[PDB]
Amino acid sequence: MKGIIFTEFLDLVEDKFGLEMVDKIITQSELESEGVYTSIGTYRFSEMLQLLQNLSANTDVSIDDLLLTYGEHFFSVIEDSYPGLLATYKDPIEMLASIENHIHVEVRKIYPDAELPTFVVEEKTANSLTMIYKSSRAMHHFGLGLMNKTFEHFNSSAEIILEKIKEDGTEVKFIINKNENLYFQ
Ligand code: HEM
């Protein structure tokens, strides 16, 4: 895992739960880095899993909801760091169907040591998209938060249903349906 994921996450923990919680989940965790990360650094995901599990136990917020909130926050990091890559797309469904064969291809050029999930499109229309998410890190809700903000970026919204094919969240079917445009709301 790249260090930018660690630094932005602990920034969000400090922003939402306080600096003492940042020190707490770091103290409860070991952690070859010992809690010191750099943006271009490469660290084991087991470090992040410890940080998430300890934060969830301390705050009583599920890892699902913590990763969802973080995934939504990380879209703003994408907005401010790669606006040209984001400006390539004009439709949220087309962008999400382009994560595997374009977006994360560019990410591997940024970070050659990147450890990324796989997204496989099984069905796609103009307002629907079904993809299979596969990753040993089971960060489906991190991707869900990024998907939520992808639709928000294009002034849209979507119902996104997650079906865990493997119970540990390492294979998840995403059923994305752009919402009814309630034009008379
Ligand atoms: C242009 C926009 C995007 C940029 C710049 C980007 C860059 C990354 C980076 C840097 C990482 C961390 C890699 C590592 O730690 O080695 C990453 C991991 C991830 N990204 Fe992308 N990403 C982008 C669009 C998406 C979108 C839209 C989704 C939602 C489906 C997405 C779902 C993920 C997930 C779920 C992970 C966690 C790793 C895993 O699941 O195994 N990304 N991305």
> With contact defined as beta carbons under 8 Å apart, do 48 and 1 qualify?
yes
Tokens standing for residue 109: 């050029």
How far away, in angstroms, is 28 Cα from ligand 1 center? 27
How far away, in angstroms, is 156 Cα from ligand 1 center?
21
User: Alpha helices, DSSP H only, in the chain?
Assistant: 3-17, 19-27, 45-59, 63-81, 83-87, 92-96, 104-110, 140-153
Q: Which domain holds residue 60?
A: 1-185
Question: Using the 8-state DSSP alphabet, how is residue 9 labeled?
Answer: H
Ligand 1 site residues (CB inside 6 A) read 1-2, 5, 78, 82, 85-86, 99, 103-104, 107, 111, 114-117, 135, 137, 139, 142-143, 146-147, 150
Ligand 1 atom nearest the C-alpha of 81 is: 5
- Count of domains for the chain: 1
Q: Which residues contact 51 (CB under 8 A, 6 or more apart)?
A: 6, 9, 10, 25, 26, 29
Q: Which residues pair with 177 in a beta bridge?
A: 128, 159
Going by alpha carbons, the residue nearest to atom 18 of ligand 1 is 116
Q: How many whole angstroms from 21 Cα to the centroid of ligand 1?
A: 25
d(C-alpha 130, C-alpha 172), whole Å: 11
Whether 76 and 57 have beta carbons less than 8 Å apart is answered as no
Query: Could you tell me the resolution of this structure in angstroms?
Result: 1.6
Q: Which residue has a Cα nearest atom 5 of ligand 1?
A: 78
Experimentally, how was this structure solved?
X-ray
